[PDB]
Write a protein that binds this ligand. Sequence first.
Ligand SMILES: Cc1c(C(=O)C2=C(O)CCCC2=O)ccc2nc(C)n(-c3ccccc3)c(=O)c12
Ligand SMILES: Cc1c(C(=O)C2=C(O)CCCC2=O)ccc2nc(C)n(-c3ccccc3)c(=O)c12
Ligand SMILES: [Co+2]
Ligand SMILES: [Co+2]
Lengths: 379, 379
Amino acid sequence: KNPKSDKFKVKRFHHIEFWCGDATNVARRFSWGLGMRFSAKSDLSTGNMVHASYLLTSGDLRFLFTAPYSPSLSAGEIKPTTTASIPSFDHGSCRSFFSSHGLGVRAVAIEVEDAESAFSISVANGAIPSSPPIVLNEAVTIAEVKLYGDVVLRYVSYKAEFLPGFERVEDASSFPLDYGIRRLDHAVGNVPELGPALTYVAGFTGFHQFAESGLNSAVLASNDEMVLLPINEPVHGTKRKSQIQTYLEHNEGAGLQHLALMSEDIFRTLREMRKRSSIGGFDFMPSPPPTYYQNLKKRVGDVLSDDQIKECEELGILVDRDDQGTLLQIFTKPLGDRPTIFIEIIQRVGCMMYQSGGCGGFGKGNFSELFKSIEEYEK
Amino acid sequence: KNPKSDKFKVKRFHHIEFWCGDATNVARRFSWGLGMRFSAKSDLSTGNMVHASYLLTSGDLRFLFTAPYSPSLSAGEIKPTTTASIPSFDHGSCRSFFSSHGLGVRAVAIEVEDAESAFSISVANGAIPSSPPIVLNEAVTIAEVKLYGDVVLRYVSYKAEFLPGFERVEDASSFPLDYGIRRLDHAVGNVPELGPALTYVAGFTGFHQFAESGLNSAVLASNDEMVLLPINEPVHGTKRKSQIQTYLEHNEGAGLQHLALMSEDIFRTLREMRKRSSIGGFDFMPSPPPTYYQNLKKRVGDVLSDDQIKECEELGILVDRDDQGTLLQIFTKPLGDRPTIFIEIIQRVGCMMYQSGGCGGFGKGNFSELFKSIEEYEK
Ligand SMILES: Cc1c(C(=O)C2=C(O)CCCC2=O)ccc2nc(C)n(-c3ccccc3)c(=O)c12
Ligand SMILES: Cc1c(C(=O)C2=C(O)CCCC2=O)ccc2nc(C)n(-c3ccccc3)c(=O)c12
Ligand SMILES: [Co+2]
Ligand SMILES: [Co+2]
């Protein structure tokens, strides 16, 4: 059931912004690890005396990495005379965020029809304002409201190239890496209490609800279910400590838990990412046991060949299924020092009309099944 | 002239420690960019609730990358009960350093015969104490005094594996990268005033002095001239602004300007590093013009073949010469967001007895010659 209750017109995920201590090193690591190209910059070389921002792209996926310069470089500026390309940026906020949470996502940005309208309607419906709408070079409008913790939901709307004041990266500095990643599928938050978090976000967006170990979760979705925002809370008092609780402890509270990146070919993406794990890229979760794949035949043997199923076995891919589609997924180890944010690589099969959003669900069946397999691998 | 006036027994450079916001991403970037292997760790997985520290090695070169965790993880600890493996570490100092300076070197560590003696003698001769000697697992002693800015000179001495509490990295996670880098040749500081900086450091170490555009410099050297510590000050009032002054402005004062890394084969090192520049590694300075290499024949045509000289031309290597040896060198672009720290790759030829330290000098002749070539390339 989809009541299509969005209080304003939402299009697609637009970008994800990481707040960093040093944007250059994080951006270069992520570029090599994920196969994303350096596409745009805003920094000292573009006249920005406030922050260094580097944009990586793979298909429609946009990762932005931002770090503050010394405040002394811009001490004479005021907001009317700022050289920042992202006017919501604040040195103090950025340093406070990074010292509190470590490397992580500051902004989940969605493209809307009218960012000023989205901001006004959101705050009229309970959103906590974070940065008011500002029109950039009469071309782009950006506004921000609080999402959870110190993460903001950023609205961006275009009258008619990332943002004004960004420059395209020199082609010599822009190597055309591509491991198959194409778009952001969903972005997941961890909170202490799911109920109040859901009521708040659904309250100001009109997003609707989309349809034992560790967590309770629920998913908020835009009208066409292309913007997907799951939220988790911990379940306390279990034998094994909730990884949601561990997240909240090491992150100093609520924040973004994972980004799920859709691949057009998850087998190629994982081959390429795993090649680079020990040479600067990303590590993956420990693989499921053979019993997990010895049980895939009964569960998805009509969607994947046995050659493809053991090709999932090589790469350690998990598979889950809903009533409408099938889901291939795998999780990285945490992206930085703290056991907080990680990445999920995903590919969805089914639900063709284009593919409808959330085809196959989010893999919650893989909790029971992966442990069931581990225990029956003890055998 | 070498008076051999060291006030305590100094052996070799031991390690360089970077203070980071996220040690994982900087370490992974540096590993791929420089061809250094992950060799040791101290972090949550080793029981360290205070800081994440990752050690990279190439030959005798040791780069350590350290970042703080949330203070809440260790709020119950006191110094007697600390889980930190580097007891001089302080959350507040580390965050203050990184917010002030950005990514950069906190510690230049040298191995000595007796770190407690070196500390006591140093402070008796004017060194500003930073961290008192502490014996680690009855095996290693570490002490720190101020060097310049917020950089410390760290003394480490061993009774008889990096530091206690560090663990060897799993071989699966330890890919054997090697681009030919073998040891730290020198470590260079930028200060506002050279005179007082030299008097201070030479005062407490007994290091001796080793023997127009932008700077004045001088080099302090240990008895066998294997520990080399050049220091630069800006020269003001020139047409082109001093890069030393630019450093001091963007760094918020004095600090480490560059690390010079000796290669056993600078041609292989540069081939490998340049292959990776646009795929997560390091960028290099713009190459000298053909006139620079069209003038190398007259200057070093008796040390390098014409095939090797144009092989310097391919890689953009600079060459300089003293009265005793020859020096091949090249400089990276800054290692992070700010125009502050960079790396030099070096190889020295001559002065065989082993090779004596500083063979060929430090390339100061390449200032005049590189511009002379650029202007006569205008031709
Ligand atoms: C992270 C995740 C998801 C997931 O994306 C997710 C949810 O957890 C809540 C709904 C929204 C959403 O996107 C689904 C299934 C998973 N299954 C397992 C076995 N693990 C896992 C747990 C320990 C160790 C290795 C993997 C996961 O992390 C895992
Ligand atoms: C950095 C450096 C050194 C050097 O290592 C160094 C000194 O500067 C002082 C003595 C101790 C020491 O180790 C030597 C020669 C150099 N020559 C040039 C042309 N440039 C340079 C300047 C602009 C743009 C591209 C290169 C340098 O940076 C440069
Ligand atoms: Co997910
Ligand atoms: Co040098």
